[PDB]
A paper describes a structure:
In order to shed light on this fundamental mechanism, we studied [name] [name] (SaFapR) a transcription factor that senses the levels of malonyl-CoA, a key intermediate in fatty acid biosynthesis, and modulates the expression of genes involved in fatty acid and phospholipid biosynthesis. [name] has been shown to globally repress the expression of the genes from the fap regulon encoding the soluble FASII system as well as two key enzymes that interface this pathway with the synthesis of phospholipid molecules. Like most transcriptional regulators in bacteria, [name] is a homodimeric repressor. Each protomer consists of a N-terminal DNA-binding domain (DBD) harboring a classical helix-turn-helix motif connected through a linker α-helix (αL) to a C-terminal effector-binding domain (EBD).
The structure of SaFapR in complex with the DNA operator revealed a strikingly different overall conformation of the protein, compared to those of the ligand-free and the effector-bound repressor. Two SaFapR homodimers were observed to bind to a single DNA molecule in the crystal. Each protein homodimer exhibits an elongated asymmetric conformation in the crystal structure, in which the two DNA-bound DBDs are structurally detached from the central dimeric ‘hot-dog’ EBD. The amphipatic linker helix αL plays a major role in stabilizing the molecular architecture of the SaFapR-DNA complex. Helix αL interacts with αL′ from the second protomer mainly through its exposed hydrophobic face (including residues Ile59, Val62 and Ala63). The two DBDs from the asymmetric homodimer interact in a similar manner with DNA. The SaFapR-DNA interface mainly involves the DNA backbone phosphates, except for base-specific interactions of Gln41 (from the recognition helix α3) in the major groove and Arg56 (from the linker helix αL) in the minor groove. Importantly, the insertion of the guanidinium groups of this arginine from both protomers promotes the opening of the minor groove, inducing a pronounced local bending of DNA.
Numbering used by the authors:
A (entry chain C), C (entry chain B): 4 to 189
B (entry chain D), D (entry chain A): 7 to 189
Write the structure that this text describes.
DNA sequence: GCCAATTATATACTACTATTAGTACCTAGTCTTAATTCCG
DNA sequence: CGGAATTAAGACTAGGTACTAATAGTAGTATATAATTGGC
């Protein structure tokens, strides 16, 4: 009886569904939203969403052009700035998936993952591997916080790179980590 | 200039080099009818343009949530509250560096940290400090058996020692300072 | 029996027609463009043009809220800057309607109109009337030129304001005008 | 609290203060039925909302081209090429300052300048210099009779004297230096 | 001169676009007639 | 309890919105069957 979603609300829900799954057909959207295929076609038109085949092409073209490297995909956080073998900075927005549901505090491994990722990105060498790490959780990182991690090369031997990581939330040190990165010119 | 077999070998290479090519474009490029390309692609088991584009799109899609978005890392096998606990982690393609095939540093720490939170049976448990060592390189398809033991316990902290193995080979060692509160 | 205007071309022509006459109905547009009233409604939707009654309201609301004064409507050119009874500057884009069709040169009265208008705007007094003017057309103002007129109060008696107008096109003096503006504090 | 006549008086003033008001809004404000509001507007000769909004929109609309976008200013009466010419200009509401009711300075100059271009029978005619005087105030509904006479002619210029009248009363005097070219 | 290879031709498909048509409903009225209140 | 004032009820309108439905056309195929050419 009550079609819960009005014109504007339905269109935003359609917009989000197409993003979430570009491989969806107008027929499936019509069944999901309990609206005519003609309404779905009108909705995509107004929202400037192209047809299925055009969406699939754009997804394939991004992958074919090789936009966003393997290095970018397997990295925790967003890399902001890199000075090879000198200093690097990454950011990490703390989402509901990173916090303990009961407390709303970020899990230990979340902050270490960003820190370790930053070190591998910082060292411009063929083979880079973490050998040792000494970490400290100064303050509780809570939900919706954005962690600004900065890594600096403090020392460099013939076999290792010594990195100091300092992570902040609104210029408040929340994490400190010392990294022993093994490096090889092969 | 190109005979049946030679043309097909050039068609398969052209489609491999550009999957976005149409049968019409191939007809003009090879100076042959559209019906021939349809027969050629059939013999070479090459699907139509739209099916080719879909496969390209489908390949770099279906991304599994990265380690920071994961709750318990690994599979919890045994737990003796505030005593000893053990978890198993199968190293999949998602855990290794594509180039080297070696597990990422944070992958093994994630399993260790997760195991510590599971081991301490208290209302609020938080990691305060950790000192970790990567003894051996954990490679693809290895199964990491992590074992955590409570070594000390103060009024505010729990001291845990984690030892991770691949068969009977120590690959990881970690010391954990777990803060605990009975509130 | 071809319909000269395609989807995109028709929509631009519709947009311009509604801009030129907001009082137009969807029925007239359907007849003018030789398409169905439904296509017209679809076109306005995509172009984010509201219905007739909503358009008429917006026209009435602008007029009611006193947006653009009577003084601003009776003015030749666009008033850019005013320092009451000191210095003022107006702009005038030379359109096809301002030039002699054969030559492409602006008509004499066009430049004087902008100059005179600027003087009335410059003098902040209840009653302002032009009594005398001495003007000179230094260079030929052609089509598509933008005339930058600047008026300055050079003298002021008990009954008059003496204004010097200098009009330029890309920093080239094209017009010079001396104005004797009568003023009364009534 | 408000009787028939008193309510209508207040309704008339409310619609005058806000023409965008609906009959529904008036029914709630005056604590009376919509049918009554409809009867009130009828007796007060007030049209419906949509008709009221249209009249507001229509008033500040339908604008004629400003003097700078006009070719010949006035109506050309008589022309004796390169000798004497006369033009007539009826001073409409569009030519006067709304508040004073006096014709704008540029209106009378426009008629004068236009008359000079019409007077000189040459391929290219351009105003080079002009010295003008506004003797009397030209008001709304006056008809300006402008007469231009060629006083001198050089190899490059035509010297014209313009005298504009209302009734028989000199309101404008102008001296024009018109450049002329045979090519 | 045969058969394999190649082209022509005729049918259908999916997932659309662009356009036409048509329904129910909306606002803010109209115009009419009928019933029912206040108030003196 | 009367008539003037007021409200209620019913039937219509313009210029739409919002939605459903359906058609011709489209790309880039498919399936199958026939007819023609080219190569030894």
């Amino acid at each position: 009886e009550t079609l819960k979603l009005k014109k504007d609300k339905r269109r935003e829900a359609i917009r989000q569904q197409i993003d979430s799954n570009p491989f969806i057909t107008d027929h499936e959207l019509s069944d999901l939203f309990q609206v005519s295929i003609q309404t779905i076609r009108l909705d995509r038109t107004y929202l400037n969403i192209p047809e299925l085949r055009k969406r699939i092409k754009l997804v394939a073209e991004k992958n074919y052009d090789q936009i966003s490297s393997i290095e970018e995909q397997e990295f925790i956080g967003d890399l902001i700035q890199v000075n090879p073998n000198v200093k690097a900075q990454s950011i990490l927005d703390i989402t509901s998936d990173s916090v303990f549901h009961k407390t709303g505090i970020a899990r230990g491994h979340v902050l270490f993952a960003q820190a370790n990722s930053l070190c591998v990105a910082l060292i411009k060498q063929p083979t880079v591997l973490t050998h040792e790490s000494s970490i400290q959780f100064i303050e509780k990182v809570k939900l919706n916080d954005t962690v600004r991690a900065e890594a600096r090369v403090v020392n460099q031997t013939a076999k290792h790179y010594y990195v100091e990581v300092k992570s902040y939330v609104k210029h408040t040190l929340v994490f400190k980590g010392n990294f022993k990165m093994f490096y090889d010119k092969r």
